[PDB]
Structure formats: C-alpha cells, structure tokens
C-alpha cells in the first residue's frame with residue numbers, strides 16, 4: 001500500500017495468497033514486519049517500481065514473476081528504472097535475470113500451480129479441486145488421479161483450466177493451509193528472504 005515498510009510485487013491472485021502462506025511457515029512475519037503483498041494484475045511491473053523506486057517513495061520491494069522470454073524485456077523495463085542511466089540492451093536473457101536478482105527481482109522457471117502439484121502438494125490440490133468442482137466428469141477425475149499417482153505426467157492445460165474455473169485466488173486461499181516449509185519454491189523463498197533482510201537491516 002503506502003504505509004508499508006516493504007512491498008512484495010506479484011503477478012496475480014494466486015501468488016497474493018500463496019506467498020503469505022509460505023512466509024508464515026518460513027517464520028517470516030509479513031504483517032508484523034509491515035510488508036504487504038501487491039498484485040500488479042498481469043506482467044507490467046514498471047509503474048510499481050517507479051512508485052517504489054529511488055525517484056518515487058524509495059520503499060524496499062521485491063518482484064516475483066514467471067519466465068514464460070518475454071521476461072527479458074519485462075526486467076529491462078524495471079532495471080531501467082531502478083538502475084537508471086545504465087544501458088541493458090546489450091545483455092541476453094540470462095544476464096538480465098542474474099543482474100535483476102541483485103535488486104530482489106526473481107524469476108520462476110515453472111508456473112506456480114504446476115510446480116506445486118509436482119513439487120509435493122499433488123494430493124492437497126486434488127482435494128481442493130474436487131471440493132470446489134464436485135461434479136467433475138469421470139474422465140477428468142481419472143485424469144486427475146493419474147496426475148496424483150505420477151506428478152510428472154500432468155496435463156498442464158487441464159489443470160490450469162480447472163483452477164481458473166474455480167478462481168485462481170479462491171483456489172490459492174483453499175490451498176494455503178496445506179503449504180509447508182519443504183515445498184516452498186526457491187524463487188518465493190529468495191524473494192521473502194530478500195525483503196526480510198532489507199527491512200531487518202534498516203533496524204540494524
């Protein structure tokens with residue numbers, strides 16, 4: 001918001017509710033620290049970096065975004081703000097990505113819900129889907145049971161289709177009680193630790 005000590009910038013509603021849930025099980029207390037999670041409702045982070053950057057309010061902030069590329073241009077647009085005057089057109093995607101981590105901007109190589117399904121939350125996500133979609137046809141229920149039994153053969157199209165039908169935010173809120181420290185995606189842990197460190201250092 002505007003009375004925050006820090007901001008975690010996020011693409012949509014799923015991260016808006018999953019990120020605080022992972023913060024709690026990492027013992028990083030976002031509310032007590034005065035850190036708010038803000039959805040930019042898409043992939044354009046530039047207005048928010050302008051608001052929170054050195055020429056705006058100068059508020060510690062981090063970014064969580066998906067590789068998809070077109071992430072190179074997306075990050076060049078925020079690097080032009082937070083590292084102004086410097087040219088970045090010469091850099092390739094990987095150099096832009098590793099430069100961006102210095103400013104707390106982190107890229108995920110695998111979209112959030114499929115990563116969680118594969119990365120240890122398969123049976124919890126199946127339980128939410130069937131609570132929220134209680135009249136799934138038999139073929140879809142069998143496909144979903146097949147992804148649980150073998151989380152490397154997920155039909156990603158159908159999984160995301162089911163989650164979007166439930167509502168990405170509603171799904172994330174229903175899943176949030178199930179997350180644990182050991183299934184936290186690396187890019188979320190990196191961003192949470194980065195903003196925590198920045199706020200704690202100001203106390204130091």
Ligand SMILES: [Hg+2]
Pocket residue numbers: 001002007036037038
């Ligand atoms: Hg905000």
Ligand SMILES: [Hg+2]
Pocket residue numbers: 001007038048051
């Ligand atoms: Hg904001």
Ligand SMILES: [Hg+2]
Pocket residue numbers: 001036037038039
């Ligand atoms: Hg917000």
